[PDB]
Design a protein around this nucleic acid. Structure first.
Lengths: 121, 124
RNA sequence: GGCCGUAACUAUAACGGUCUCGGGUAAGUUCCGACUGAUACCGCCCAAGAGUUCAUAUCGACGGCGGUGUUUGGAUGGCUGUUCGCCAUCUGCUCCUAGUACGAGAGGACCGGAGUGG
RNA sequence: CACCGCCCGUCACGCCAUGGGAGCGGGCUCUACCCGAAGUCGCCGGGAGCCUACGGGCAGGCGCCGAGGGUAGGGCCCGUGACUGGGGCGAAGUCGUAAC
RNA sequence: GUGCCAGCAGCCGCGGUAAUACGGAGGGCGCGAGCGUUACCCGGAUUCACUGGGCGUAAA
RNA sequence: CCUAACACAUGCCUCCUACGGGAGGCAGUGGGUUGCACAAUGGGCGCAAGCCUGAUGCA
């Protein structure tokens, strides 16, 4: 979803605002919403947690205003901007639980941990 | 002071200041050795006192003295500090219990063995 | 204003003599706190050496001949005016083949095909 | 080991030690405004519902308080800390010789 | 035996070739299913002095 | 248990799930003795018998 852009944590250990500083997928991916991987940067965090402040990591996108639709064409737009950091190079979603609703596309095979939590969708 | 003054300001109770922050005012505190160096005595003494920096479970990291003829104290050797200054080694407010944890007791002790954690020599 | 010698490990030298680090940042050069071809570049010739051994897989001393017109000459961002630089961060990926060939393991194809992306 | 004595300060090295402190993080003690669960309580309860012996009850609705959350500022002392200061002792460091 | 070493150490101190102070041995002293250590409180401390301290030169 | 008013299997955040949604003192475990008994005294209930009683009496 383009660099900059404030994204909230929807999982844990490093609260509030998290800065997207890149978008992978390759050369010139302008955006990336739905549930793509996105290089993030913590800027606030709760005093506690095992992930401090200003830790350049990557993450996923759970709830994004841009919407997600498919089939019929109906759309589910969530006005928010969900991250949900993942322990970086040994890829996997770091944390315990996830907050709020999630997306049905987020259930993408290789993911799966995240969707058996955050009781929703 | 006048009596009236006493009534007004009164006397100030003395505050004792601990000379052993073995924190939690414990009787002993165990930690781990950082360095088992050696230090030179003070003002009129000479010798190479055996000492050890210790990382306490109390969070503090202090310098303790090693009593006895000869220790077997290394690095990551767990030990028990007991508090006791040493007139010659400033910055040394505790002794190291010998006979506890990684601090082996003094070998060939026959006298004040208790103060050196060395069992009763099986006399035959 | 200079030059010189000097104390406990060095370094410094009170004495004597003499005429970059920290901060902010994912990243902070700002900020805050302390025509010609000599030359150049590119190539080739000889092969002492190195490469366990073996000149030429890779590289190559001492020296040698040229080609060019090009230097000196006659992907998003941070910093900076910068160019540059340092720093952060058409074709991809996946599955099947096949965890097989290969391999001590670790690991892991070819060929061919299937889907989904920038 | 007594004037070929003693001894001071700058700077430099040695065993040792350490303070001040802008901010950044966290805690205690909070202020202002916004959001605000459960629950008691208050009001409505209507040709909007269920029950009725028509008196009323329940459902439901709204509201105050309210755990807690949010944005801004302040207190705690704990942490870190580029910045700065730098002290006790010392046999043969350097420049002088202040003092006795 | 060791030789300011290795070490002891509560305080004063002991060890630099005759060490009752280190290490062992013999012997001894004290306690005895205990003995010794560390920690803390009171004591000793009339050293916060009411009992019961002081202030010319010691702190005042 | 003087520390961790730390987390607690079993008997007297963690766990289950069909992902929709659910469940959460005595002795002992981890971390930094899982004993016996209603006999006695006391308590709950009962018209009482008696039943319950890790209080308690004991080991």
């Amino acid at each position: 979803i383009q660099e900059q852009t404030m994204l909230n944590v929807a999982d844990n250990s490093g609260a509030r605002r998290v800065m997207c500083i890149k978008v992978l997928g390759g050369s010139h991916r302008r955006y990336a919403g739905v549930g793509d991987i996105i290089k993030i940067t913590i800027k606030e965090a709760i005093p506690r947690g095992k992930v401090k402040k200003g830790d350049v990591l990557k993450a996923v996108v759970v709830r994004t205003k841009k919407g997600v639709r498919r089939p019929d064409g109906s759309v589910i737009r969530f006005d928010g901007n969900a991250c949900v950091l993942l322990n970086n190079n040994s890829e996997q979603p770091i944390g315990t639980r996830i907050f709020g609703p999630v997306t049905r596309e987020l259930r993408s095979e290789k993911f799966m941990k995240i969707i058996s939590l955050a009781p929703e969708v | 002071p006048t009596i009236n003054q006493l009534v007004r300001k009164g006397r100030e109770k003395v505050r004792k200041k601990s000379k052993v922050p073995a924190l939690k005012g414990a009787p002993f505190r165990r930690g781990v050795c950082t360095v088992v160096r050696t230090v030179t005595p003070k003002k009129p003494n000479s010798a190479l006192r055996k000492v050890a920096k210790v990382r306490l479970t109390s969070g503090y990291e202090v310098t303790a003295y090693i009593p006895g003829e000869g220790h077997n104290l290394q690095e990551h050797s767990v030990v028990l500090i007991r508090g006791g200054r040493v007139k010659d080694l400033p910055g040394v407010r505790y002794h190291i219990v010998r006979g506890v944890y990684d601090a082996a007791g003094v070998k060939d002790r026959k006298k004040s063995r208790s103060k050196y954690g060395t069992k009763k020599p099986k006399e035959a």
